[PDB]
């Protein structure tokens, strides 16, 4: 789950989740919040562990 910029589509969020983070997004479900921000749920490709990515990010 990431806050992304509110003027990106789901295709360019997948391509940024490949160049920053060396993982493969199979499904992005975006959501412009009542805060005003766009939140994306980004499911990884089951060849990539979610905790192993989230430790490298650190959270």
């Amino acid at each position: 789950t990431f806050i992304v910029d509110s003027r990106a589509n789901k295709t360019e969020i997948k391509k940024a989740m490949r160049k920053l983070y060396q993982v493969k997004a199979v499904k992005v479900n975006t959501l412009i919040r009542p805060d005003g921000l766009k939140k994306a749920y980004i499911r990884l490709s089951a060849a990539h562990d979610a905790l192993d990515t989230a430790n490298k990010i650190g959270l």
Binding site: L20, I57, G58, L59
Partner: protein
Amino acid sequence: SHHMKIKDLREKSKDDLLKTLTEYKKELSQLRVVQQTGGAETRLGRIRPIRKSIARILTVLNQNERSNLKMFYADRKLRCKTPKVLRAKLTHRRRLALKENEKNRKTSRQMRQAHKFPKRVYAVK
């Protein structure tokens, strides 16, 4: 801490300046995760010195692009295809106004009467 001085930053090339811009956009992006997951007040708090040094790399990159493009259109007779972002921005009214190579244009007779009868300096006693 890490803080790009601009005097050692203007001596870089266009490739090394971009390579240290991705270096510092990446370091800012992994402090936006410690700004959301708690964060010690020392690691966080390098957010201004990074974000103002990104502003120094981009102002060296952009001042080197307008310098190498203003010296691409004033070089020769290509100054009709000069894009208007590079032209001398004045007031809108001052660009349309008559230049002073113009506007002192005068008739062959108006030149003669200022040469046959010029305004004299004189006194009185």
